[PDB]
Amino acid sequence: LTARLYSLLFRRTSTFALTIVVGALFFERAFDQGADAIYEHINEGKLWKHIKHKY
Amino acid sequence: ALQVANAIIGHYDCTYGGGMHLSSPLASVAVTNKLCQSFQTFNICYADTGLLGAHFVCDHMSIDDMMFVLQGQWMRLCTSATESEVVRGKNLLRNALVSHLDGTTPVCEDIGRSLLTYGRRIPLAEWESRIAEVDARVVREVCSKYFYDQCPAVAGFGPIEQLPDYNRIRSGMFWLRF
Amino acid sequence: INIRKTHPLMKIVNNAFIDLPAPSNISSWWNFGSLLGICLILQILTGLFLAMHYTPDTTTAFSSVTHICRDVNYGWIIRYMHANGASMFFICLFMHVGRGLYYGSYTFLETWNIGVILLFATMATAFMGYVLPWGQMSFWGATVITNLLSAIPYIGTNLVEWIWGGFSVDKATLTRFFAFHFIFPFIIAALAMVHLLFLHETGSNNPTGIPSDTDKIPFHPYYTIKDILGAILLILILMLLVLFTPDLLGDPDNYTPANPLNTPPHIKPEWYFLFAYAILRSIPNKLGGVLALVLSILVLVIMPLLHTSKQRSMMFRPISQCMFWILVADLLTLTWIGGQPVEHPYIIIGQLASIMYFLIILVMMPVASIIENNLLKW
Amino acid sequence: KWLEGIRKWYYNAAGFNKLGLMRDDTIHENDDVKEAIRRLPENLYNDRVFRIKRALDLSMRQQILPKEQWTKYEEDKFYLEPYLKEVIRERKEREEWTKK
Amino acid sequence: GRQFGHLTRVRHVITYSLSPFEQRAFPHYFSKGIPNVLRRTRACILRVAPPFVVFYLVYTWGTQEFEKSKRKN
Ligand code: HEM
Numbered sequence: 001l002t003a004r005l006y007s008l009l010f011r012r013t014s015t016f017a018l019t020i021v022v023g024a025l026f027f028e029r030a031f032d033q034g035a036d037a038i039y040e041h042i043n044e045g046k047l048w049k050h051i052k053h054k055y
Numbered sequence: 056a057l058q059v060a061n062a063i064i065g066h067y068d069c070t071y072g073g074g075m076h077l078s079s080p081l082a083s084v085a086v087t088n089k090l091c092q093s094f095q096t097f098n099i100c101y102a103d104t105g106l107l108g109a110h111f112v113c114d115h116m117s118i119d120d121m122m123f124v125l126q127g128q129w130m131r132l133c134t135s136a137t138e139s140e141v142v143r144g145k146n147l148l149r150n151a152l153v154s155h156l157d158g159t160t161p162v163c164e165d166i167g168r169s170l171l172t173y174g175r176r177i178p179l180a181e182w183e184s185r186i187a188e189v190d191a192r193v194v195r196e197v198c199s200k201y202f203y204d205q206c207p208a209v210a211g212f213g214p215i216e217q218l219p220d221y222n223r224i225r226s227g228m229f230w231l232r233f
Numbered sequence: 234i235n236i237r238k239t240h241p242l243m244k245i246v247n248n249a250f251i252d253l254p255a256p257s258n259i260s261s262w263w264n265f266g267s268l269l270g271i272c273l274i275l276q277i278l279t280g281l282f283l284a285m286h287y288t289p290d291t292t293t294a295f296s297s298v299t300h301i302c303r304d305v306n307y308g309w310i311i312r313y314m315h316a317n318g319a320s321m322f323f324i325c326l327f328m329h330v331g332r333g334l335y336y337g338s339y340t341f342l343e344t345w346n347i348g349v350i351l352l353f354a355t356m357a358t359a360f361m362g363y364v365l366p367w368g369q370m371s372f373w374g375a376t377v378i379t380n381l382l383s384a385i386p387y388i389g390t391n392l393v394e395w396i397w398g399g400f401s402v403d404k405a406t407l408t409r410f411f412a413f414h415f416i417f418p419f420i421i422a423a424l425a426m427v428h429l430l431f432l433h434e435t436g437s438n439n440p441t442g443i444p445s446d447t448d449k450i451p452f453h454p455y456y457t458i459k460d461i462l463g464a465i466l467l468i469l470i471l472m473l474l475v476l477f478t479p480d481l482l483g484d485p486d487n488y489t490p491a492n493p494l495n496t497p498p499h500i501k502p503e504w505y506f507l508f509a510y511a512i513l514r515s516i517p518n519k520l521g522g523v524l525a526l527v528l529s530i531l532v533l534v535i536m537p538l539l540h541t542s543k544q545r546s547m548m549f550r551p552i553s554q555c556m557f558w559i560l561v562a563d564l565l566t567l568t569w570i571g572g573q574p575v576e577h578p579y580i581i582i583g584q585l586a587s588i589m590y591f592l593i594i595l596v597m598m599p600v601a602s603i604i605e606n607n608l609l610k611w
Numbered sequence: 612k613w614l615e616g617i618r619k620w621y622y623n624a625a626g627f628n629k630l631g632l633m634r635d636d637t638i639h640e641n642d643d644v645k646e647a648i649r650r651l652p653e654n655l656y657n658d659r660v661f662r663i664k665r666a667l668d669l670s671m672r673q674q675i676l677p678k679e680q681w682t683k684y685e686e687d688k689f690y691l692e693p694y695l696k697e698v699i700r701e702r703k704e705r706e707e708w709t710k711k
Numbered sequence: 712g713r714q715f716g717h718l719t720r721v722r723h724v725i726t727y728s729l730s731p732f733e734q735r736a737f738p739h740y741f742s743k744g745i746p747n748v749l750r751r752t753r754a755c756i757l758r759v760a761p762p763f764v765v766f767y768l769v770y771t772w773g774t775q776e777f778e779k780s781k782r783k784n
């Protein structure tokens with residue numbers, strides 16, 4: 001549950017450096033999708049993709 | 056396995072013969088910069104528990120240096136355990152074990168504490184076999200489990216004014232490969 | 234043994250960051266040294282990219298800053314980081330000084346002197362920075378304060394002739410003020426190192442007032458991550474300010490080009506010089522106002538020379554603690570008054586609060602000290 | 612006197628009754644205080660460093676010992692004041708002989 | 712300000728330091744924290760708060776007096 005995470009990722013230093021790089025790219029892709037989706041959701045309607053589709 | 060490791064590291068006192076030529080790197084450095092009065096790095100165990108221990112006596116203006124080189128040798132055994140040091144430790148284990156089991160009281164002491172705990176006495180063929188079983192791979196396995204980022208117990212006594220905080224022992228206890 | 238203890242740079246690093254024996258008692262009101270440092274080098278960084286994309290000439294100044302607003306990628310956030318980082322910087326500098334006056338670290342003398350010099354340097358530096366971006370408020374307030382430099386007898390007017398390059402605020406004067414804003418923060422950083430050098434010599438101070446030589450702790454890594462925490466709180470305040478109300482501390486009256494014929498009525502410097510404009514305009518004189526200003530900062534110099542208590546802090550002196558919070562309210566009062574234009578009740582309480590300020594310092598502080606001295610059976 | 616009750620309310624409102632420090636503990640150090648602290652017996656000296664160490668720990672954790680362990684005003688067993696005033700007088704006498 | 716080892720002299724003091732992995736990250740973070748911070752809240756308003764209300768009243772009083780000095784046309 002968590003002992004797996006400690007044994008695979010949080011013993012050695014190169015394993016920890018690789019897992020923070022891996023988490024960086026995973027968090028990159030995920031958070032950009034979330035930011036785009038939520039930000040267009042609070043700005044539904046009057047955004048230039050929408051009017052661009054209506055042009 | 057810890058007997059082999061603490062045969063490599065082991066003990067020093069200020070009243071020995073030949074300081075700059077000790078095989079033990081901790082002992083050579085502690086002669087070099089004149090750090091410790093004495094130390095012992097050893098094992099004591101109770102029934103499936105106990106204290107894998109180390110104990111140094113020195114002046115208070117040299118404490119963090121001694122602690123630094125002590126943790127440095129521990130992590131050197133943790134990562135770069137090569138063969139010749141393991142060989143030398145197994146020779147010292149032979150010598151200490153055989154010359155310990157001598158006489159009347161050490162013999163009968165061994166047998167009494169063996170058959171209160173084990174249920175049996177260890178013969179010397181078992182000691183020679185369990186010396187021959189353990190190499191540097193077993194050393195790095197045991198050192199990766201027992202030492203590498205484990206919470207310590209530090210007993211400090213006397214002029215402890217330089218002796219660092221517990222978090223320095225924690226953060227320098229492992230290596231981030233420096 | 235270790236490279237940290239023997240390497241000739243790393244001994245200085247060891248005596249700087251790793252092994253400073255700090256007291257184990259300070260709350261978050263001691264963060265502001267490293268906070269002012271990170272603010273300072275962030276200011277240097279933002280201003281450096283600014284000066285990469287800026288041309289200093291009155292033909293091209295506001296057009297160049299407009300170009301930073303338009304065409305430089307994230308240039309608008311770099312310009313706003315510089316401006317509101319200066320505003321955050323002066324907030325945190327008043328926090329640092331308010332600490333050092335409250336908790337009794339002003340018994341340290343030469344460090345206090347070098348701090349006072351840093352106060353002068355940061356005032357002049359951010360002032361000429363405000364002269365740079367070529368606004369209505371910039372041009373006219375710098376014109377006023379150029380005449381404030383002319384206020385002194387017998388030396389001052391030819392001195393202002395010498396700083397003019399002519400008779401008024403001209404292109405040569407703009408480039409002068411550009412180079413001085415462009416070069417003074419490095420002298421600020423050097424005297425910051427001198428400030429820190431004297432403090433590493435003496436030793437720090439606790440919140441209480443009792444020197445804590447029994448209970449020191451290593452500086453790393455408690456205060457490293459404590460000041461990183463303080464930095465994150467600082468940076469989110471800075472960024473919420475630049476991303477949600479940039480024109481809050483920004484000015485409406487700033488953004489026109491510098492018209493030498495307008496002189497708008499609601500005239501003001503930035504918020505951090507409002508007491509510098511109110512205590513200025515309080516006493517009905519040219520000489521009296523400028524001498525009152527320089528005498529106010531020289532009163533801030535005097536503030537250690539009249540410590541006649543026998544405790545160290547104001548924490549265990551309650552009457553003087555109430556007096557100190559009265560001083561806090563009075564400085565904020567004159568700040569709001571300096572923001573407000575010149576009308577009759579504000580004239581009244583501006584004069585009243587200025588003379589209250591000098592009466593609090595030169596008379597009330599040692600008298601409160603001797604009452605607190607007398608009352609504990611001394 | 613009424614001013615004695617003023618002192619009573621003051622030693623209430625100060626705070627180091629709540630911390631557990633006596634009056635000879637909150638003294639700002641010049642060199643005279645340094646000499647006065649060295650001119651002390653061992654038991655007073657260790658009591659002084661222990662009470663200061665408890666004050667630093669309780670001020671770090673910002674938690675205060677209750678009413679039951681506070682220094683009452685009628686147990687102000689001040690100790691350092693005569694030593695300090697004698698070092699004051701000897702410093703004064705040395706001052707005066709350097710004057711004239 | 713020097714090294715550790717010559718700061719000052721203290722004898723007869725034993726300190727029991729607990730490892731941080733033994734204790735929880737936030738023990739009694741509300742259950743003692745909120746009543747004791749309301750206690751320290753009680754310990755500060757009668758020292759610091761009277762300048763707050765003085766500035767508060769002088770601010771709104773000056774604004775009212777300011778608009779009244781306007782409105783006397
Ligand atoms: C140029 C801006 C300044 C910077 C970057 C600065 C930086 C620092 C730093 C890093 C420290 C050590 C850590 C700390 O106590 O926060 C410090 C301490 C101190 N500073 Fe400044 N300082 C500045 C301005 C001033 C000014 C204007 C004064 C007032 C004259 C002052 C008075 C002090 C005092 C009294 C201390 C000792 C406080 C203590 O460590 O207990 N500083 N400063």
Ligand code: HEM
Binds near residue numbers: 273283315319359417
């Ligand atoms: C040496 C490093 C610095 C450089 C290169 C620099 C550069 C500049 C430049 C080019 C401008 C004019 C651009 C503009 O604001 O539209 C400027 C303005 C300014 N600077 Fe700096 N600066 C530096 C350090 C500082 C520091 C340390 C402060 C104070 C914390 C500061 C405060 C200001 C202020 C308040 C303005 C006016 C902002 C405005 O109203 O638009 N600068 N700086």
